[PDB]
Structure 1
Amino acid sequence: VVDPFSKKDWYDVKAPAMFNIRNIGKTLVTRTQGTKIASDGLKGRVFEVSLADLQNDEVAFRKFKLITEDVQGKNCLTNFHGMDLTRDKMCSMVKKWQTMIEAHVDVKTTDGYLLRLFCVGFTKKRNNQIRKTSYAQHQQVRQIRKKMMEIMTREVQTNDLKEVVNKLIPDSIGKDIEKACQSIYPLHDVFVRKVKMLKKPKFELGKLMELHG
């Protein structure tokens, strides 16, 4: 003697000031009933949303994540959780006859926000090269894997979480390796290829409202 899609009222979702479009979508939860509140459970989602739809006209392969840490009332504000690239895009990249060069790190920002960053690179094969392979020797390779690491920390260590999310919209870190590896071995398809949050600093409510203002 019941219809289960009456006890569900349509609220709204938001994104921070660093990305372009403000309005993502909507989400539904049950009312204040028995002993559970409609603003207690609605405080830790993950929306694995792209960038193209979040912006005007971008490269779409990057994704993002935006958890709910605060609830306004008919509006769910959001907080940082992760990056990733698209399955398809990354599978395309890996090819036979070329080395691949991964490398990772656990940095911290100045504000609490602790972060694990992955990386990746592929040796390029030039225009007039007859040679089939394009392989790179061990000791060639581990001087890239130390540069990849050196460059990631420098550009996060010294400045806060609000400034290292505006270095991943194109991929700041990405092309800045490409430039500094050339004279060791030339590689092309450089990325951060996953960025993952390991810890958070305690919730202060006014901290989140200069990101929406």
Structure 2
Amino acid sequence: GKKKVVDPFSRKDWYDVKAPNMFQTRQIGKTLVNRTQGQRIASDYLKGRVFEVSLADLQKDIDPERSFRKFRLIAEDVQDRNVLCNFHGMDLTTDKYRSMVKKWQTLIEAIVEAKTVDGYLLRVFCIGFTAKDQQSQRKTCYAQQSQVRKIRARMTDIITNEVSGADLKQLVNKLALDSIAKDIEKSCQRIYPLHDVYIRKVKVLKKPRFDVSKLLELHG
């Protein structure tokens, strides 16, 4: 038989959430956490939580080339109105993917699972879109699929190298400039002319240890 006062809003504290270092704006917010009781661990009720904001907005690219690319954060550690927020994942907006994908083209999907230098084992989904040649009288441009298989073989070959090049930090940096997309592009076009390529989704789920010392490197 609990029964709390009312206006529990006037019982939920205040807190600042910090984004990551190598983005741009290391404030992404302030938000309203439960007041620390000795019958509630508000710090634990800040930690498990995972957020997504598109990197474009945080990066504050005014005309956003980055508009689609969705980015996940996880609120690692609580210290005096500051919450750190490491890399958790990167998805993609449904808007971009769906609009590009208009009949008349072979579609490719590739898979990699590979391990970073720290024990995050992350799975990247490379998604290939295919391009009609200039003055292609052929309205539909279809791959022979020796092509598609070979592109898939190249897609996985390129992404595996890239993952193991230093931790999530260096991995996400490759995502940011999209050097992966360019390396895909030079290699794929030898096989077959290709349009739009992105790293589409990445899920980390193995996350090694809390490893707070190396974690605090991220903390500016």
TM over 0.5: yes
Check if 1:124 corresponds to 2:136: no
- Aligned alpha-carbon RMSD (Å): 1.4
Deviation at 1:53, TM superposition (A): 1.7
Percent of residue pairs bearing the same amino acid type: 70
Deviation at 1:34, TM superposition (A): 6.3
Tell me what 1:209 maps to.
216
Deviation at 1:44, TM superposition (A): 1.8
SS in 2 for 1:103: strand
Check if 1:93 corresponds to 2:100: yes
Normalising by structure 1, what TM-score? 0.95
User: Hey, which of these two has a bigger chunk of helix by percent?
Assistant: 2
Aligned partner of 2:51 among 38, 47, 52: 47
Tell me what 1:161 maps to.
168
* Separation in structure 2 between the aligned mates of residue 170 and residue 88 of structure 1, nearest angstrom: 21
What do the CA deviations read for 1:113-132 (whole angstroms, capped 9, x no partner)?
11010011111002211111
Runs (5+) with no aligned partner, structure 2? none
Provide closer, same or farther for how the CA distance between residues 30 and 56 of structure 1 changes in structure 2, counting only shifts above 3 A.
closer
Deviation at 1:46, TM superposition (A): 1.7
Deviation at 1:29, TM superposition (A): 2.1
Tell me what 1:188 maps to.
195
Residues paired across the two proteins, number: 213
Is the Cα contact below 8 Å between 2:165 and 2:171 reproduced in 1? Answer: no
* Separation in structure 2 between the aligned mates of residue 67 and residue 160 of structure 1, nearest angstrom: 16
* Separation in structure 2 between the aligned mates of residue 211 and residue 51 of structure 1, nearest angstrom: 17
User: Hey, which of these two has a bigger chunk of strand by percent?
Assistant: 2
SS in 1 for 2:8: coil
Tell me what 1:11 maps to.
15
* Separation in structure 2 between the aligned mates of residue 67 and residue 171 of structure 1, nearest angstrom: 23
Deviation at 1:175, TM superposition (A): 1.7
Is the Cα contact below 8 Å between 1:65 and 1:81 reproduced in 2? Answer: yes
Is the Cα contact below 8 Å between 1:156 and 1:164 reproduced in 2? Answer: yes
Tell me what 1:139 maps to.
146
Tell me what 1:76 maps to.
83
Aligned partner of 2:73 among 47, 66, 74: 66
Is the Cα contact below 8 Å between 1:31 and 1:37 reproduced in 2? Answer: no
* Separation in structure 2 between the aligned mates of residue 67 and residue 114 of structure 1, nearest angstrom: 16
Is the Cα contact below 8 Å between 1:62 and 1:86 reproduced in 2? Answer: yes
Deviation at 1:138, TM superposition (A): 2.0
154-163 or 14-23, larger mean C-alpha shift: 154-163
Aligned partner of 1:199 among 189, 206, 211: 206
Tell me what 1:114 maps to.
121
What do the CA deviations read for 1:38-92 (whole angstroms, capped 9, x no partner)?
1111102222101222113142111101111111121111111100111111110
Normalising by structure 2, what TM-score? 0.92
* Separation in structure 2 between the aligned mates of residue 184 and residue 90 of structure 1, nearest angstrom: 23
